[PDB]
């Protein structure tokens, strides 16, 4: 039932589709899953031998997915053993227009579809239940950035385990190193 | 200080302030070179060795020589952390 973007679903993507189908036919959230849909799914190693799976939801359904994501992620976690689950919207990036190019688009690139905006949105969507209360880009002596993200204290014990998988997912998608912290000052 | 042959050609290497990393001039008579005695971990007695902090006269005049020496001692374990 998944609507793929590469026109050929993978075995893991079909497995996640079957899990969502089972949650649709028999679960506590069957009323809202009807119009919901995902576009892709991948699994990657976040460190050592641990794995986490990324679900790419279409953007217009992102809010609908999030209002039930807290419920959905627990079921998908108990279903797939020790593999962490994240929901990140399928956001496309249009390249920066250059004077060496052709008629790519007669109208201006939207600012929500640039690389920096899409990466900020990916970071925001990586931690849905916990909001971002701050950001500090550290530039080390060798000139390599390290982003340090501040999250809510009221979501500390609930999400601190999900860290080291947020960083791995962000490194896989965007290539940027990110750390997560929970400042004492509110 | 080093020519292309690698030989050192400076008259001398002047001290740098332990706080500001600025050169202490040869005629800076307000600068100090304080020695802080090192102490045994179980007896608390002088070890015969010490730690040296050089503070220039500009820091002394502006009054931050005390805070600079305090921070240098803290960052060295002579003064207890917190």
């Amino acid at each position: 039932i998944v609507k793929p973007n590469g026109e050929k679903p993978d075995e893991f993507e079909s497995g996640i589709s079957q899990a969502l189908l089972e949650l649709e036919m028999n679960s506590d959230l069957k009323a809202q899953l009807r119009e919901l849909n995902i576009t892709a799914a991948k699994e990657i190693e976040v460190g050592g031998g641990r794995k986490a799976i990324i679900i790419f939801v279409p953007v217009p359904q992102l809010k609908s997915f999030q209002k039930i994501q807290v419920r959905l992620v627990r079921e998908l976690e108990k279903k797939f053993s020790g593999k962490h689950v994240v929901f990140i919207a399928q956001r496309r990036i249009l390249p920066k227009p250059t004077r060496k190019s052709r008629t790519k688009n007669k109208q201006k690139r939207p600012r929500s579809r640039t690389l920096t905006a899409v990466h900020d949105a990916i970071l925001e969507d990586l931690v849905f239940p916990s909001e971002i209360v701050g950001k500090r880009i550290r530039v080390k002596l060798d000139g390599s950035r390290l982003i340090k993200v501040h999250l809510d204290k009221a979501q500390q014990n609930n999400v601190e385990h999900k860290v080291e998988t947020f960083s791995g997912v962000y490194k896989k998608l965007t290539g940027k190193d990110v750390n997560f912290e929970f400042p004492e000052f509110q | 200080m080093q020519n292309d042959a690698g030989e050192f050609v400076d008259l001398y290497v002047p001290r740098k302030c332990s706080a500001s990393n600025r050169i202490i001039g040869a005629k800076d008579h307000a600068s100090i070179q304080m020695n802080v005695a090192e102490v045994d971990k179980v007896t608390g007695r002088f070890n015969g060795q010490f730690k040296t902090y050089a503070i220039c006269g500009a820091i002394r005049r502006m009054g931050e020589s005390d805070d600079s020496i305090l921070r240098l001692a803290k960052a060295d374990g002579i003064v207890s952390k917190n």
Binding site: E131, I132, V133, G134 | -
Partner: protein
Amino acid sequence: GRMHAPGKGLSQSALPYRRSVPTWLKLTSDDVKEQIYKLAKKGLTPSQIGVILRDSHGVAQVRFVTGNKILRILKSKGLAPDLPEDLYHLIKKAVAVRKHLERNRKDKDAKFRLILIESRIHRLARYYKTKRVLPPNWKYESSTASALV
């Protein structure tokens, strides 16, 4: 500092870092838009609409809830004033001081303040004509100022 006064004030709002809808806001975007339309139909400017929504119903920022600014929402449905609100208020102040100066010709401070107000009006009108918010031939005149208010 101020454009027409020697003052250098630091008073202005400090928007919070979090751009999210507050947890206490059970009002969805469409209810906010409906209340905006009702307040505009009552004859209120976007500034007053925002003040009322922040004060009584409780909306940190309309932009964080509906995704659009108040004036953009009004223009989208179509309820916005023909001329911009700040320009309208400047013209209103100019009309007030001009009416005062008629019976107070000895008030030479009022004349100076009126000159400053009309300079502000001319600058704002030039900016609005640059951005096509005003017609290219839109002119402010004393004999026609009260016709715009």
